[PDB]
Design a protein around this ligand. Structure first.
Ligand SMILES: *[C@@H]1O[C@H](CO)[C@@H](O)[C@H](O)[C@H]1NC(C)=O
Ligand SMILES: *[C@@H]1O[C@H](CO)[C@@H](O)[C@H](O)[C@H]1NC(C)=O
Lengths: 48, 91, 25, 48
């Protein structure tokens, strides 16, 4: 519901969604060949 | 969970190696983990159940070799500097 | 001895014992 | 003391980062810790 939202907010009115109390499998994100940019800072995607 | 052997542990992103034992120290209702001195995680409460764990660092020390002159004899004895004798056989 | 008051357990750090114990000094 | 690293424990850095990215932070920690140990040993030599 965050990545596949039908409408996106303008960058000057950026939204914010809090995620908690769940198991996160981020491998689903960067394994998908659908993102032109996937850059991390202070953490590594392979070990997330 | 195992207790009386040195083990690798990862508690909710807290990684370390040591021996885990039932803690005499008593936590306040929802303190998470103690650090007795110098930000060493000396204890942690389990996330799955709610027991309190006391952590003692992995037993370690210096090994030294006692020897008479190799001129005179070849027999040699070895001394482990800081360990109880019952737990040396591992290393 | 009873007047003078006198390293905590930690990683890396270690304290050797003195060669002559107090009982023999 | 973090010495300007991401965190103050080797385990956090080596669990958060990949080898080219982790190496610089580990070096940042190593240089500071080595300097502190050198100062301590020089002080001990003078006091001895
Ligand atoms: C062997 O060498 C040691 C080392 O200096 C010396 O103390 C000892 O007297 C020597 N013994 C013989 C038989 O050469
Ligand atoms: C060494 O360990 C054994 C078993 O854990 C124990 O019975 C003994 O009292 C210990 N001795 C010392 C000096 O720690």
């Amino acid at each position: 519901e965050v990545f596949n939202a039908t409408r996106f907010a303008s960058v000057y009115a950026w939204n914010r969604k809090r995620i908690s109390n769940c198991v996160a499998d981020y491998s689903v994100l960067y394994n998908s060949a659908s993102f032109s940019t996937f850059k991390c800072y202070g953490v590594s995607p392979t070990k997330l | 969970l195992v207790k009386n052997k040195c083990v690798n542990f990862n508690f909710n992103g807290l990684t370390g190696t040591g021996v885990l034992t039932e803690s005499n120290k008593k936590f306040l209702p929802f303190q998470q983990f103690g650090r007795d001195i110098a930000d060493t995680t000396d204890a942690v409460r389990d996330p799955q159940t709610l027991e309190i764990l006391d952590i003692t660092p992995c037993s370690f020390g210096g090994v030294s070799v006692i020897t008479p002159g190799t001129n005179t004899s070849n027999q040699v004895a070895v001394l482990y500097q800081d360990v109880n004798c019952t737990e040396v056989p591992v290393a | 001895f009873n007047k003078v008051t006198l390293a905590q357990k930690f990683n890396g750090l270690t304290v050797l014992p003195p060669l002559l114990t107090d009982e023999m000094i | 003391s973090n010495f300007g690293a991401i965190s103050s424990v080797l385990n956090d850095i080596l669990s958060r980062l990949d080898p080219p990215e982790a190496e610089v932070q580990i070096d940042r920690l190593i240089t500071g810790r080595l300097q502190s140990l050198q100062t301590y040993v020089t002080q001990q030599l003078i006091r001895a």
